[PDB]
C-alpha cells in the first residue's frame, strides 16, 4: 500500500504533443513503457558512469498501464497492461470505464526496500523522477528543458493519485501513511469486491484488513 502510486499518462502526452510536436503512437508507448520498467527500479537511461540499484534487491518494482480506452489498451504490449475487461466482470468493467473515461494511467510500485528505508512520502518522488527520465530516454528529447519540468510537475502533482494524503502538523507524520489512507481508498485497495459477489464477505474482508492496517500499525 505504501510503495504504490498512480500517475496519468494523458497530461504528459499532451505536453509532449504540444511542446515538442511529437506523435504519441502505441509503438512509442511500448518503447517508453519498456524504458520505464527498466528505469523505475533505479537504473540510468540517459547519461553515463553512474551506479544503479541492484536488480536482485529491487525486483518487486514495475509499472503497468490501465486505460479506459479499449483500443489503446488493445494495441499496447499486453505485458504492461492491466486489462479492465479481463480482470473485472463486464458490469463492473463498464462502471470503471465510465468512471475513468478514455484516459491512460500508470500503476507504479517502487521497490519495497526503498520504501522501508524511507517513509511513504518516498513513492511519488521516486516515481516522478523515473517517469521523467523514461520520457527523456524514450522520446528523444533534451535532458534539460521546460517540457521535462512540465512532465515532472504533472507526475508529481497534476496527475498523481496518492494512496493517502498528508496529515496535519499535530500528527507528527507525513503523506501516504496509514493516517492519510481514507476508508474509501482502503476499500478500493482490497480486491474482494472484484473477485467475489457475496456482499457480506466483501465487507468482512475490508474490516479484517482495515483493523490490522489501522489499529496494529497506524495506532500501534
Amino acid at each position: 500500500i505504501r510503495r504504490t502510486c498512480i500517475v496519468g499518462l494523458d497530461m504528459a502526452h499532451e505536453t509532449l504533443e504540444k511542446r515538442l510536436g511529437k506523435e504519441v503512437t502505441p509503438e512509442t508507448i511500448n518503447h517508453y513503457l519498456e524504458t520505464l520498467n527498466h528505469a523505475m527500479p533505479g537504473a540510468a537511461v540517459v547519461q553515463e558512469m553512474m551506479v544503479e540499484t541492484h536488480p536482485a534487491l529491487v525486483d518487486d518494482c514495475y509499472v503497468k498501464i490501465f486505460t479506459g480506452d479499449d483500443e489503446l489498451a488493445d494495441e499496447i504490449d499486453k505485458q504492461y497492461v492491466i486489462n479492465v475487461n479481463k480482470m473485472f466482470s463486464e458490469e463492473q468493467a463498464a462502471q470503471i470505464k465510465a468512471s475513468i473515461g478514455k484516459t491512460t494511467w500508470q500503476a507504479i510500485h517502487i521497490p519495497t526496500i526503498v520504501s522501508r528505508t524511507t517513509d511513504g512520502a518516498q513513492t511519488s518522488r521516486w516515481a516522478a523522477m523515473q517517469i521523467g527520465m523514461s520520457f527523456i530516454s524514450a522520446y528523444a528529447m533534451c535532458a534539460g528543458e521546460a517540457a521535462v519540468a512540465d512532465l515532472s510537475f504533472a507526475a508529481k502533482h497534476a496527475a498523481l493519485v496518492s494512496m493517502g494524503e498528508m496529515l496535519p502538523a499535530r500528527r507528527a507524520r507525513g503523506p501516504n501513511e496509514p493516517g492519510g489512507l481514507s476508508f474509501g481508498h482502503l476499500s478500493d485497495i482490497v480486491q474482494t469486491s472484484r473477485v467475489s459477489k457475496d456482499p457480506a464477505k466483501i465487507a468482512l474482508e475490508v474490516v479484517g484488513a482495515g483493523c490490522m492496517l489501522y489499529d496494529q500499525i497506524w495506532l500501534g
Binding site: I6, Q92, P111, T112, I113, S115, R194
Partner: protein
C-alpha cells in the same frame, strides 16, 4: 459494504481499484485475512530482503 451489496465495482476510487488488480503483488489483496493467516504460519515471503548484501 455500503457499495458491495450494490455490486459496485469500486467504493470511492476506481484508479485504486484497478491499480491493485495485479497478480504480481507478493500480497494477495483478494484474500487479505487469508494472507494474514499465511503470514502467521511462517509461509509468507515478503520483498525487501537484503540477504544479497548482508554477510552470511
Amino acid at each position: 459494504a455500503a457499495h458491495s451489496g450494490r455490486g459496485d465495482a469500486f467504493t470511492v476510487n476506481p484508479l485504486l481499484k484497478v491499480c491493485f488488480a495485479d497478480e504480481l503483488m507478493p500480497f494477495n489483496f483478494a484474500e487479505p485475512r487469508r494472507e494474514f493467516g499465511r503470514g502467521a504460519i511462517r509461509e509468507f515471503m515478503p520483498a525487501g530482503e537484503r540477504s544479497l548484501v548482508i554477510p552470511a
